[PDB]
Assembly symmetry: C6
Homo-oligomer: 313 residues x 6
């Protein structure tokens, strides 16, 4: 539907930051599954269970075939490599889905999604009404107009009761902010762990005859780039959700003050909201104040009275 | 069609839990077919038909070429590996399809799908009727209104006879719950079976000269992750279907009590349902009570009488 | 078009059974083309042209390079492997297409597809007619109504002549049933033929120096699974087409008995069908009896007479 | 557009036979580019420049590395292999496109495509006209009806002049029939040429030290299957285009005989066609005779006279 | 939009010739990136820095491992191979895009694309006008008709001023013709350059110990086929653009002669075009003369006068 | 929506230059991930830590196996290769996205996107108004016309207040121009860095026994082509954005001069713009001056007065 209105700018960047976050998660994963391999080599002179590093030059020979060379690469990869280096693309992808699920849950939860689809449905008609064009400053339009005055009154009573919508949007962003804090807590705490050069001591000498081997992870660099890039990405994410939250706290969105509009419209009979209907009003005000302005007329009783006089006449 | 109304929240999470369940089933399968390989190495000093594990160090030589190294990998993979480790992604995929087939069968079975497509078709018009806007508190609308009063009466008689729809939805969720119990019965019972390090004794010494070989499954870890992840996923699935079932049992959905609505509408002439028409009413009530409220007016005979007086006039 | 009505439940499961049948046919084929390889090894001590199977252990050497190892794998694969093991996915795919072609041929054959597109086109209008809503228990609607009475009479005469449609649907399912019987006749007769371990005696000793070689087909297991799975699948297919056929035979679908409906409608003037128009009626009755019920009114001459009196008036 | 009418059953099977023809052409090509490789081995004891075929057994050694083994495979593949074996999938694909281009050229050629888009456009309206429903056995409809009588008369004169459309459809199928004959002339003449086992004598002994080598084409079998399958496919193609051609010759489609319809309609004033307008009529008659029947009324002058009397009145 | 009218047959074949041109460009490129490899072998007895070509036979040994065999293949590929052999698919693709850009630039350039979208927009209405049906041989239609007479007069003045559209179409085809001449100038001049067998003298003996090496490009044949195929393709392209150009030159398209139509319509008051409005007329005349014929009536002043008399009346 | 109007020719080439820029970025990246490999060979006689380059010829032997040959290739690739050579396709892709984000941000920013969607919405109706057709030289149209006069007056006041739209478009192109300058600053400064032949001195002799190795990057050439091609591409990009910027500076787009149009229309009562409404007018003028011309009539008060007199009458 026309839910583009329903997403402020802090939700729209958030939409696309939650897309390139996916694109690196998939791009790293499809890369990981492709090779994610290592090249493990022994060390003859070992000290500390570490490579002691002790005419023309010639090649060294360890007298080993291809498979046990492949075997040793698996083990040092299996055990002497960090889980974080291996499951990095599969991890942020998981996180990328939550930030999506923690937006569309709002739109998709039925007890609210009816309220949303109702709130929008009336506002287009109110935005499109010919009669407000007169009242903002024929008879068939009056029947249509008054027909809308009634459901507006029922809608005003039907949805102002609940408070679940504001609770969800609150419950939604608050966890995503909480979620953001943890990603930075551990991810930086292990980004140092990945690195090209690595040494493994794995205790297989009945099979090869060597104990310690030096390997080399070719992708440790690139995965470091995505992490530093991803972290920098998610930092900008974390500030977006922080800002709108403070805005949700500072502004006290349960109620809306019509008192500025009623000066201009010169309508002394217009009520304020109580709960769950000013929040959605507070939202669409963020898109623009226009739709809220056109809505003052269908709410005022004297505006109906003006129609009712013109309709009787 | 507009079957989004037809799926409560317990059916909507169920829809998407039955999507990522697919995504790991395909992601594991496309991974499995790619390599699903092993690296089998012999053991010179064997005891118990097990690897006895008995200047500078040097490589061991078994004096073997690439193919018989590939050959032995197949056999130990073929026979000394668990079917569960190999066919895991192809298995949950199968299960993933059933949970889909055990939802759309309801929508797709024709003896009911007509009833559903009829039940929805009338309710939009009843939801969209201008005349209820008056009656909930012109003449052309009355012909349209009374035209709907009749088919409503025929629909009220046509579908209230059967009870197949409630039987299907019952027969549907009950097997999915039953299905969930079995997945946990065996899957945990064999998740321990998969593991990186494995040893095979395969009796081929006329061809290699060795009997026992130690292999290494590189993917045993990741498949363990998907299983523990999948099982945790399906647990949340199993609770969803459990809850709605209890709700289907506790609430006695064959009949619906209008008696709360008739207080507010102030309509003493409004009948209750008997069977297969309150269940579908009980459903859409879960989406919202609104559509049920607008439907009280087209059902009451005095409401028709009110129209009939206004239509005669 | 709206041909969903045209497919009973025995045609709808048949539609989707003829989809997963495809998915394994393609999944096996794309797998087959990928490797479908073998690992052929010689046997030094041979008896019967069979592998006689005659300090620490050491590797055996046949003194052979990679290509002639690849060469021998081709030949034993080429000649000492069953065609059924190799062309299995390419075979059921062929069969999968026939079961599709042996459904849409009905819809696509023009001499009938006009009749179908005509039969449906009138029935929507008859289903949608406002006047039947009165007659089932204004003047502009009468012109529209009587306009439909005429083409109905012409349609009643135009299509009741032929009998090709019933012949096609008969000729269609009968071959698919016949087709199903053969798939089970040979496929089980050769599913035993595939197997992991195989031995080939191929007479190439001028090139290798060995005669007999033991190979190993890694995919013999999985292809056995698809076959047992496919066969179990097609068994359920074969029963579907068997049931509707018996139903086509038991029920004598050339003619339809209106005699039950005419009791309820209280219309003594309503004729029965003769041929090729009750069959299509017998079909849509399977979807629901409703559309047939709404159609009794446009067929009865007194119903036209009732309109004709109201139209004259 | 609604050009489904424009394709008889001989054009519709032809459409889909020209699809699976593509699917094997692409499936063979994507397979060919993948490997299309050979395994060339020397022969020590040669006679006639042919492999003379002259304790336990042991491997033979030619003392050769991997690349010159790869080198020799290219040359014997390059020169001592038939072009037909290598370019088979790329060849029928070419032919597959012609049979498509030799259908849509008709629809796409503008001097005719206007005539087609005109012929169809009028016939829907004539099919949809309410007034023919009366005349086949109000005033606003008469203006619409007579409005169509005029452009029909102009269309009758505008397009009956030319004869290009019948010439194209003739020129179209005649070459496709001619084309079919050649495919069978050469393709069977070289299908014998492909085969698994092959021997090459290539004169490179300064580089390897051997002259003659025996290779093995692994795909010679499968390509033989596609050819025998393709040829059997195109035979069924060749008969389709043969049949409609004879039908185009036997039936003398430049003119159409209305004389059967005019008996039933009881209209003695109705003219026959001369050229290029009966052919398109002869076509749509093949789809059904109905549309031609509804068209007799807008063509008869007395039918206009009947309208003209009712329009004057 | 409905720009199918805007492309004559010489533009429509040109559209599809510029599609298969793409399909070989991509098919060669995706093939090139896949391997595009060589098999370089040394030559022991060299003369002229060329391979001198100087019991049973045995393999020759150069005593070399896999990588320096891979190394040498790169260098002889890098330096002793023609750029044309390597970048062929990436080259015609570039050219394939220009011929597309040198068509849609016309449609996409805004100063004209408004004129085109205006010229088409009026012509549909003029084609669809009911009143021309009378005039080619009610009052509300006259207001609509005369409403169109005015904008036609303004359009006649608004666009006849410029001459950019004819200049673009001229400037467009002239470069594509010029472009075609160059492709044949160089491409044939280097198609001889590619070839299977090649020899490289690369001066690396400190690393291998050999100087000269004979390589073999396996794809030199196929790329030769695409070039000869592509060149033959583009020849047919080059004639298309040549023909329409001569037609643009011979015919003097700045002005259009109405003088043939005005005989048939019997309208002595109808003006000819001057510039940029007869060219677009000359175009659509190529699609068909019909739309031009229907347009004579809205242009004639006496035709307006005929309407103006009927509108006054 | 119909935002094709909103993009001048300098934005349309910019759209497609920002597409092929993507196509090489992805084509280089998917190529890079595929191999991006090297072939590192040692050098026995080294001088300066550089390859000293010091019967029949024979192969040199370094006595090394495949993996340590693979190992050394990683290290010289890892450390002795430029980051620019490796991350080139991943870099311009990043830049390619900015130039896209630095266009759609304008369309997507909500505080303006409402203004844009409003500005367009009124202009279609004004373009489509029948009454302007009269006024540029009935009563129901006057109500529609005057209805538009009012919202035009409100729109004239509502949006002329702000100046954010002109600020964004300014802030948008100015950074893209600034961005272009940097790409040329560094990219040419390192394009020399990539090259086929390279030598690495990496200090691993405990593992191989050699210190210095000569490698060869096979893709250094092609990446050089894309860079020189890309740079030439982006130069043409950089001039486009330069031109429109100067045009935005020279022309003083905050205000628009109606004074030329008012001569032709002969309307002395028509006001000029002040800010943020002439800029968008200045834009659409670039598409064509027509829409601006039709807009003069709905803005002039005497034009309303002309309607108001005709509406009163």
């Amino acid at each position: 539907p026309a839910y583009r209105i329903l997403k402020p700018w802090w939700d729209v960047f958030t939409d696309y930051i939650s897309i390139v976050m996916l694109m690196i998660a998939v791009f790293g994963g499809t890369l990981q599954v492709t090779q994610d391999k290592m090249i493990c080599l022994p060390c003859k002179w070992v000290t500390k269970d570490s490579c002691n590093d002790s005419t023309g030059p010639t090649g060294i020979k360890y007298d080993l075939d291809r498979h046990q060379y492949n075997y040793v690469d698996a083990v040092c990869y299996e055990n002497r490599l960090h889980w974080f280096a291996k499951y990095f693309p599969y991890l942020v992808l998981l996180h990328t889905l939550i930030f999506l699920a923690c937006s569309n849950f709002w739109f998709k939860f039925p007890r609210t999604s009816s309220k949303l689809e109702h709130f929008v449905s009336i506002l287009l008609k109110c935005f499109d009404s010919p009669w407000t064009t007169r009242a903002l400053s024929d008879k068939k339009e009056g029947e249509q107009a008054k027909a809308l005055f009634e459901k507006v009154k029922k809608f005003r009573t039907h949805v102002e009761e609940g408070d679940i919508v504001y609770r969800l949007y609150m419950r939604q962003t608050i966890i995503k902010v909480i979620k953001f804090a943890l990603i930075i807590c551990y991810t930086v705490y292990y980004v140092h762990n990945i690195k090209f050069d690595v040494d493994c001591t794995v205790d297989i000498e009945s099979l090869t005859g060597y104990r310690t081997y030096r390997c080399a992870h070719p992708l440790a660099t690139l995965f470091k780039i995505l992490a530093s890039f991803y972290i920098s990405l998610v930092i900008f994410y974390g500030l977006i959700c922080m800002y709108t939250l403070w805005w949700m706290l500072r502004r006290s969105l349960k109620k809306y003050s019509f008192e500025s509009i009623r000066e201009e419209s010169s309508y002394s009979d217009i009520p304020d909201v109580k709960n769950d209907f000013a929040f959605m009003l507070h939202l669409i005000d963020q898109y623009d104040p226009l739709y809220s302005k056109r809505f003052a007329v269908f709410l005022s009783e004297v505006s109906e009275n003006k129609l009712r006089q013109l309709n009787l006449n």
